[PDB]
Amino acid sequence: KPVQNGSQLFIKELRSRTFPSAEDVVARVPGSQLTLGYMEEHGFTEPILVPKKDGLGLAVPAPTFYVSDVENYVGPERSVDVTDVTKQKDCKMKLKEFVDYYYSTNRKRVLNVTNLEFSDTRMSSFVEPPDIVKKLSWVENYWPDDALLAKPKVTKYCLICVKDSYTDFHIDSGGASAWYHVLKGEKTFYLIRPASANISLYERWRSASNHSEMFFADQVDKCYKCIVKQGQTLFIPSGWIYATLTPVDCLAFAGHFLHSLSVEMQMRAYEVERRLKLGSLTQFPNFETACWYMGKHLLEAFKGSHKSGKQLPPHLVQGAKILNGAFRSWTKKQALAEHEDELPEHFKPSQLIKDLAKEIRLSENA
């Protein structure tokens, strides 16, 4: 018989198993040193652990903020997605019901809430993402407040995981980058670098019928174990393939974002998820729309570079090229009525593409 991912026996085996330490891969960095400059220097290709929130500009409630408090500020009647970890199946229920389960003592099932986005609730004012996320975020920087399409609702997630909760290996939707702040308890991350072959293996694993019977880390050379403890914040870069195990009841906050340092990985991950045709919780809404606004921004940056003579950094020019490729792909004749639904008002794709292509040429000559 095969071991089912997320099962009690799986958890036991997983806890006993040895992994390479995240020591080699995850930088420990004080909040204040996590600047745009830092990110640009290192390129945000590896996860970053910030042991204390000081300097991050992260706003979160005190650790005396409990799940019962979440219930009050989010609202007991709110519908929430709940994962039954042992079955690896998902269902819906009112938050009050989950909270009832959470506080029970005879706790049979293993259930978690991992996609409660609360920007539309009273609890929203209690949490502000780290300053660096805001500085990097395409949505925060380039999506206009008067936009007719709604901003991707992925900025503030509340996660509630019971002891022995497990979330299986995945890449975040849109190849989005993520921050995770553990308010109470702890969460163990198992991190796999998105080397090209690893991504391919991941795609083939996600698409197999027996994938819930296969431990993906078995297929790769290095899967790093990183324990994130109370008060600590982990930043996960674009495309990283990761799973998590919860050793004790945990309450955490998280957010997802796109940025200019991983344009290529973002597109690669998006193409993988579009081939998989799976989706789920935390699907990145209006990913293409964010891309369109980025594209408009780039044209403006280019045009403004003539006035100042200062060229765009090569990663931005390379980013422009990749985005233009996508735009062409999304607007070709055979290309969906799915794609037009994500185009912002007043956009002229044929012209943007033509205009971007010209500006990329003008910059390359130099």
Tally: H helices and E strands in the chain: 11, 13
In angstroms, the CA 108 to CA 99 distance is: 14
How far apart are alpha carbons 156 and 6 in whole angstroms? Answer: 26
Give phi and psi for 141, each to the nearest 5: -90, -35
Q: How many residues does the chain have?
A: 366
Residue 114 in marked binding region = yes
Domain boundaries, the chain: 1-286, 287-366
* CA gap 324, 96 in Å, rounded: 46
Rounded to 5 degrees, φ, ψ at 303 are -50, -40
Q: Using the 8-state DSSP alphabet, how is residue 344 labeled?
A: P
Give this entry's resolution in angstroms: 2.0
| Common-topology check for domains 1-286 and 287-366 | no
- Sign of the Cα torsion 346, 350, 354, 356 reads positive
- Residues before each break in the chain (C–N > 2.5 Å)? none
Q: Reading across the β-sheet that carries 187-192, which strands appear in turn?
A: 165-170, 241-246, 187-192, 224-228
With beta carbons less than 8 A apart as the criterion, state whether 198 and 192 touch: yes
Residue 181 annotated as binding? no
Longest dimension (CA), the chain: 70
* Matching residue, tokens 């970890």: 85
Question: Which H or E run includes 177?
Answer: strand 177-184
Q: What is the DSSP string of 248-284?
A: S-EEEEEEEE--TT-HHHHHHHHHHHHHHT---TT--
Experimental method: X-ray
86 is annotated as contributing to ligand binding: no
Name the CATH code of domain 1-286 (choices 1.20.1050.10, 3.20.20.120, 3.40.50.11030, 2.60.120.650): 2.60.120.650
Residue 345's alpha-carbon distances to 141, 148, 255, 342, in angstroms, are: 18, 7, 26, 9
How would you class 150 by CB atoms within 10 Å of its CB: exposed for 0-12, middle for 13-18, buried for 19 or more? exposed
The percent helix, strand, coil of the chain (3-state, each to 5) is 40, 20, 40
Please check whether the domain covering 287-366 is classified as CATH 1.20.58.1360: yes
Side chain identity at 182, as an amino acid letter? Answer: V
Amino acid at 304: G
Dist CA 295 CA 323 (whole Å): 7
- DSSP string for 305-328: HHHH-PPPPHHHHHHHHHHHHHHH
187 is annotated as contributing to ligand binding: yes
| Ligand-binding site membership of 64 (annotated) | no
218 annotated as a binding-site residue: no
Residue 244, marked binder: yes
